[PDB]
Amino acid sequence: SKWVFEHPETLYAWEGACVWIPCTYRALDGDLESFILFHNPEYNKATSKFDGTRLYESTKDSEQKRVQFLGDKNKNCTLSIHPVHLADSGQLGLRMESKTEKWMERIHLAVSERPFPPHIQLPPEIQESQEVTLTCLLAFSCYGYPIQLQWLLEGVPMRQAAVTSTSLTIKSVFTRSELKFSPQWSHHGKIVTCQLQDADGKFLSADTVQLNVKHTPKLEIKVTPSDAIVREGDSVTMTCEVSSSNPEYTTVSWLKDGTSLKKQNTFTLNLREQSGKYCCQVSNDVGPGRSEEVFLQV
């Protein structure tokens, strides 16, 4: 092919930040003679030339420039806008001319007014006491504007270490943060926030997810002489109360000192007359959960 370009389809940024556009190319007609960066170019069919605002011209050309061309005449078309503005948003046009040929390359530059939020990616299955990696992705990375990704649990910064990686190549531009932590059952339903911050820790944007932590049933056991009176062969009722269970429970059974009881497959244990330790067991798709032992005495 005469002109082959490699660059991201779209580059993202927000007002006041910067944008770094990785770009490589190759023209079979040799080195370039002119480069012009257009903003929303329009081909003028009359004059057979391109019109529109010009952000950079190789004929008129520094490090004190907002728009910079970090490339050369043979293989590099990297662009830098520092700072980038909402008006730069749109379709950039890399208008290049070789010895005998011409070419126009389109790069999409999506600049939002406010910093856009990152994205949390949850694994489909999170369960109590099983280490899980949470990933926070941001489709942005520019050297002139360093950022950071902060993990929060119920608005509180998390103490677990988070590996932060960045990519700024012709294929993809992102900032990635991976957090490893072992959740407990109480993390179910709580909010995790990936907060985007600038170099000094100033808030920019955030994404939140409500955790879904599967766990065995957590059981509250209540006995209704309040303790252990009976003193004869009285009537005692014991109830098994599920404090939390994800997913919902399936079966319930009562156990004395060790072995399950006679056909006691209900949430209430009714004794009408056997004076050991008692506890209930409730199961869900995760597995069985037990309650604390109650000691009945005559």
Ligand X SMILES: CC(=O)N[C@H]1[C@H]([C@H](O)[C@H](O)CNC(=O)c2ccc(-c3ccccc3)cc2)O[C@@](OCc2cccc(Cl)c2Cl)(C(=O)O)C[C@@H]1O
Ligand Y SMILES: *[C@@H]1O[C@H](CO)[C@@H](O[C@@H]2O[C@H](CO)[C@@H](O[C@@H]3O[C@H](CO)[C@@H](O)[C@H](O)[C@@H]3O)[C@H](O)[C@H]2NC(C)=O)[C@H](O)[C@H]1NC(C)=O
Q: By CB under 6 A, is residue 24 in contact with ligand Y?
A: yes
Angle at CA of residue 111, ends 56 and 194, nearest 5° = 135
Comparing CB distances to ligand X, the nearer of 3 and 267 is: 3
Comparing CB distances to ligand X, the nearer of 2 and 75 is: 2
Closest CB 68 distance from ligand Y, rounded Å? 8
User: What residue 22 binds from ligand Y, ligand X, none (CB within 5 to 8 A, per partner kind)?
Assistant: ligand Y
Using the 8-state DSSP alphabet, how is residue 116 labeled? P
Say whether 176 counts as a known binding-site residue.
no
Residues in 93-112 at the binding interface with ligand Y, rule: CB under 6 A? none
DSSP states of 232-244: SS--EEEEEEEEE
Comparing CB distances to ligand X, the nearer of 103 and 249 is: 103
Using the 8-state DSSP alphabet, how is residue 17 labeled? S
Closest CB 9 distance from ligand X, rounded Å? 13
User: What residue 91 binds from ligand X, ligand Y, none (CB within 5 to 8 A, per partner kind)?
Assistant: ligand X
Closest CB 78 distance from ligand Y, rounded Å? 4
Q: How far apart are CA 39 and CA 80, in angstroms?
A: 14
Closest CB 92 distance from ligand X, rounded Å? 7
Q: What phi and psi values does residue 270 have, to the nearest 5 degrees?
A: -110, 115
Q: By CB under 6 A, is residue 165 in contact with ligand X?
A: no
Q: How far apart are CA 267 and CA 92, in angstroms?
A: 68
Which residue in this structure is represented by tokens 């939002």? 112
Candidates 26, 99, 102, 190; binder of ligand X (CB under 6 A) is 102
Q: How far apart are CA 142 and CA 167, in angstroms?
A: 10
In this structure, are residues 179 and 151 in contact, taking their beta carbons and an 8 Å threshold?
yes
Residues in 71-100 at the binding interface with ligand X, rule: CB under 6 A? 91, 93
String of contacts with ligand X for each residue 26-55, x by CB under 6 A: ---------------x-x------------
Name the residue among 6, 12, 286 with its Cα closest to residue 142. Answer: 12
DSSP-assigned beta bridge partners for residue 141: none
Comparing CB distances to ligand Y, the nearer of 74 and 186 is: 74
Q: How far apart are CA 174 and CA 159, in angstroms?
A: 24
The first and second tokens of residue 38, run together, are 């257009």
Tally of CA atoms within 13 A in the half-sphere of 279 that contains its CB:
14
User: What residue 253 binds from ligand Y, ligand X, none (CB within 5 to 8 A, per partner kind)?
Assistant: none
3 state DSSP class of 134: strand
Comparing CB distances to ligand X, the nearer of 43 and 203 is: 43
Name the residue among 2, 189, 172 with its Cα closest to residue 99. Answer: 2
Using the 8-state DSSP alphabet, how is residue 169 labeled? S
Closest CB 102 distance from ligand X, rounded Å? 3
Region of 103-111, 203-211, 242-250, 268-276 interacting with ligand X (CB under 6 A): 103-111
Q: By CB under 6 A, is residue 2 in contact with ligand X?
A: yes
User: What residue 203 binds from ligand X, ligand Y, none (CB within 5 to 8 A, per partner kind)?
Assistant: none
Q: Which residues bind ligand X (CB under 6 A)?
A: 2-3, 41, 43, 91, 93, 101-104, 106
Query: Residue positions in the annotated binding site for N-acetylneuraminate?
Result: 95
